[PDB]
A paper describes a structure:
The principal target of these antibodies is the primary immunodominant region (PID) on the gp41 fusion protein. The PID is an amphipathic 15-amino-acid region that separates the two heptad-repeat domains found in the post-fusion conformation of gp41. Cluster I anti-gp41 antibodies, including patient-derived 3D6, 7B2, and F240, bind to the HIV-1 PID region (HXB2 isolate residues: 596–610). 3D6 has a near-germline configuration, and F240 and 7B2 represent anti-PID antibodies that have undergone affinity maturation.
Comparison of the PID-bound and unbound structures of 3D6 and F240 revealed that the two Fab fragments have different mechanisms of binding. For F240, no appreciable conformational differences were detected in any of the CDR loops in the heavy or light chains between bound and unbound conformations. Thus, it appears that F240 has a rigid antigen-binding site that recognizes the gp41 PID through a preformed lock-and-key mode of binding, whereas the near-germline antibody 3D6 binds PID through induced-fit. Antibody F240 shows a considerable divergence from the germline sequence with 18.7% (54 nucleotides) and 15.1% (45 nucleotides) of heavy and light chain coding sequence mutated, respectively.
Author numbering:
A (entry chain L): 3 to 27, 27A, 27B, 27C, 27D, 27E, 27F, 28 to 213
B (entry chain H): 1 to 52, 52A, 53 to 82, 82A, 82B, 82C, 83 to 100, 100A, ...
Amino acid sequence: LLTQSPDSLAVTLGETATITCRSSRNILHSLNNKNYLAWYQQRPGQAPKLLVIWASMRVSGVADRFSGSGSGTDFALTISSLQPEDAAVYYCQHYYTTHRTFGQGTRVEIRRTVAAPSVFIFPPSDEQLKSGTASVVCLLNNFYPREAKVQWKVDNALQSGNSQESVTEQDSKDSTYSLSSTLTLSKADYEKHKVYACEVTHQGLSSPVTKSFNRGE
Amino acid sequence: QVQLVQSGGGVVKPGASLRLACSASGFTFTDYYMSWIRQTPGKGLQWLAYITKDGSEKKYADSLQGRFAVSRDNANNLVFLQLNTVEDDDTGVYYCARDDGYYDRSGYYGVFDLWGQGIRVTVSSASTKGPSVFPLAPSGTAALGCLVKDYFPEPVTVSWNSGALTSGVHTFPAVLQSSGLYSLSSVVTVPSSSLGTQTYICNVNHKPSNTKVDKKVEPKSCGRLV
Ligand SMILES: OC[C@H]1O[C@H](O)[C@H](O)[C@@H](O)[C@@H]1O
């Protein structure tokens, strides 16, 4: 069992990131003084790429800013002078036995100063309502950090279980996120109420922001 | 030059079988073990199987209960993974990987130094279905979009104005709904001054259902005229 920490890390460009891997059993072999541990980098949408073997030996092509260290059961990957392309999920892997396993991964993202979301609400289209369903969409655009709370209120009643959220990958250029929250109701239920509101809480907002509309306006 | 090109996979019904394949180029295929590794929500990154250079010996993760089978065709630089009796926990991304290592009295030890691009495997009873595409009508910055609802399987592609509009576009990852169908939105922010003079059209393509939709997104009208 390999346990990485932290689960996620935000690092300012040019600064240093350190990821930890702890093994439940020693993987230092006394006879050759080697540690049977590898590190991998997985950029969004790509396969993992091998970076380090024997805990500290960079494989061909890997720059010195990626440094593996540790011994026995406690290992670390240090990324100095973090670059935009280093945002990725990093995994350790042991090969001390014939049953190789990976750690759970540590996600490294680019840190930036807080940016509040711009918030937009969309009523269902008349086209959709014809088909018997009503989707209401709340958009939170270009914010940082990723953590945000979105709550739906219908005629001031907090909704639960009838919305789903999606978040983008960190934007390559401005390092922000966007998030959609979609409330789904039957046409009949949608027409039972007037005020549709999404309430957004975010570190960048002094107090929650509410965007609303009245059905039919 | 040196690469692994994966094919196969896709949708498979629960309890059915699926074949995955991997084509090697740029290196001496018969000098390497090959392995398969998957990534799933519940189990993370998981080694599944390896196969020796000549194909005569195979080793599997016991958690698979014998359901998977690896083989290789050295004459044609191919390696295969056959999934059997698939279950929902098998949904994920499957990778073939070159397995760089060595053997001793105690077993085989190796790292994965070259990987294929990954193939998505989706275990589901859902029938192929094209999306419904609905406008997210706008309103010094305005937001607009398209809701791409109720399709199966992944993926859909969304462009704006045939690809002429890329700045400010965010196409969200699909979410799986309780119906077993996917949904996503694509949004773009644009100058308010452009509404009514600039045309905005989302182009949605869902190849599995042969669906192509071009949806004009227009500012909502409030009068009796329109
Ligand atoms: O915001 C980061 C996230 O972006 C999207 O949601 C991706 O689908 C997900 O894999 C990633 O973790």
